[PDB]
């Protein structure tokens, strides 16, 4: 993470037969190797693109090529819903438990 | 587990759902798969050598 | 719908920090994205001072971060520009406007509030 | 290095097309897109976004508005054109810093 010249590593990465690319990183370690990509050719055709969250949005999302496939979680910030469950759980398990 | 996901494609700096991953399987959607490149079909990336 | 407000002190006695207020109602205020401070001047000009994201982010103009501070209020996640002297007469025109990241799709914008600077 | 928009004061009559030149001195086109916005305003009056990337439309307005051009060179392209546009027109470029404002050329009606 955080390395400022791997132009050279994508390079070997295109020496690959394969031609898709799939990443796992940090919001500005995306948006480096967005910008090391686009300015080498990397973002072009037959180069899929499959990506995680944390490199959907954030620094890299300005940088993101075009056809950036991503994926979410649903209601990923929705609290009330997520601390409604917990106490549900919780008070369910202690019920349980002491039963 | 069986965490249900959705998956977005980039449709011109957009966020536009394409599919649900149902904990098991991805059920696309009617939008079409926008690829690198400005292409809408899809590329197959075992090209030989 | 997602509403969003700016307000602030604008004018007191001299020589004092303004705090401007902005803040966002029906829409949650920390998941992604750009917030970025507008100021305009009657002579129908726009320039930019900076962005804040959920994710942590800033960017400020190298000239401009010198009186300029972002404060966070949790109570409603509401953000602060202190900056330093206001007066009447350097009558000029401040947004506050959540955006798609990038600067590149402006999402919102504000409604503008009286800012001088003399 | 500077950023203007041709010209401040147009002739605009009704139903061809208003050519609005914003000339960006620095090269927008950034791996095959051109990051422009176009958005109204009036003095005193919150702005809102008209037109982005200049060929995505935008929900809530036909294609009266569209616009052309690449690098240096981009054109708001008013085809047909209303009474009702007469406003101050700011173009605005998306692809890093610096955030420069355009011309705001203002509108008016003969």
């Known amino acids: 993470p955080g390395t400022k010249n791997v132009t050279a590593l994508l390079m070997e990465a295109r020496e690959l037969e394969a031609r898709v690319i799939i990443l796992s990183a940090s919001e500005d370690d995306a948006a480096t190797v967005y910008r090391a990509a686009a300015m080498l050719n990397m973002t072009g055709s037959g180069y899929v693109w499959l990506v995680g969250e944390r490199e959907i949005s954030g620094n890299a999302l300005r940088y993101a090529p075009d056809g950036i496939i991503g994926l979410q979680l649903i209601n990923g910030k929705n609290e009330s819903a997520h601390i409604s469950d917990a106490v549900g759980v919780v008070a369910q398990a202690v019920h349980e438990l002491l039963e | 587990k069986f965490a249900n996901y959705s998956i977005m494609n980039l449709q011109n700096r957009k966020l536009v759902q394409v599919g649900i991953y149902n904990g098991t399987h991805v059920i696309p959607n009617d939008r079409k798969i926008i690829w690198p490149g400005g292409e809408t079909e899809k590329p197959r990336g075992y090209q030989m050598s | 719908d997602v509403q969003l407000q700016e307000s602030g002190p604008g004018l007191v006695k001299p020589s004092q920090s303004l705090s401007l207020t902005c803040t966002v109602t029906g829409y949650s205020i920390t998941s992604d994205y750009a917030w970025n401070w507008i100021r305009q001047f009657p002579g129908n000009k726009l320039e930019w001072m900076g962005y804040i994201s959920y994710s942590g982010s800033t960017g400020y103009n190298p000239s401009l971060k010198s009186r300029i501070s972002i404060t966070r209020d949790t109570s409603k996640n509401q953000f602060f520009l202190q900056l330093n002297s206001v007066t009447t007469e350097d009558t000029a025109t401040y947004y506050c406007?959540?955006?798609?990241?990038?600067?590149?799709?402006?999402?919102?914008w504000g409604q503008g509030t009286s800012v001088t600077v003399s | 290095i500077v950023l203007t928009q041709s010209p401040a004061s147009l002739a605009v009559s009704l139903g061809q097309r208003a050519t609005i030149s914003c000339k960006a001195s620095?090269?927008?086109?950034?791996?095959?897109?051109?990051?422009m916005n176009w958005y109204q305003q009036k003095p005193g009056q919150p702005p809102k976004l008209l037109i982005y990337?200049?060929?995505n439309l935008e929900s809530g307005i036909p294609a009266r508005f569209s616009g052309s051009g690449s690098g240096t060179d981009f054109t708001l392209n008013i085809h047909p054109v209303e009474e009702e546009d007469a406003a101050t027109y700011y173009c605005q470029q998306g692809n890093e810093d610096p955030p420069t404002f355009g011309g705001g050329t203002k509108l008016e009606i003969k």
């Open positions: 406007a959540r955006l798609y990241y990038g600067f590149y799709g402006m999402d919102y």
């Open positions: 990337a200049a060929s």
């Open positions: 620095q090269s927008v086109d950034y791996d095959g897109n051109s990051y």
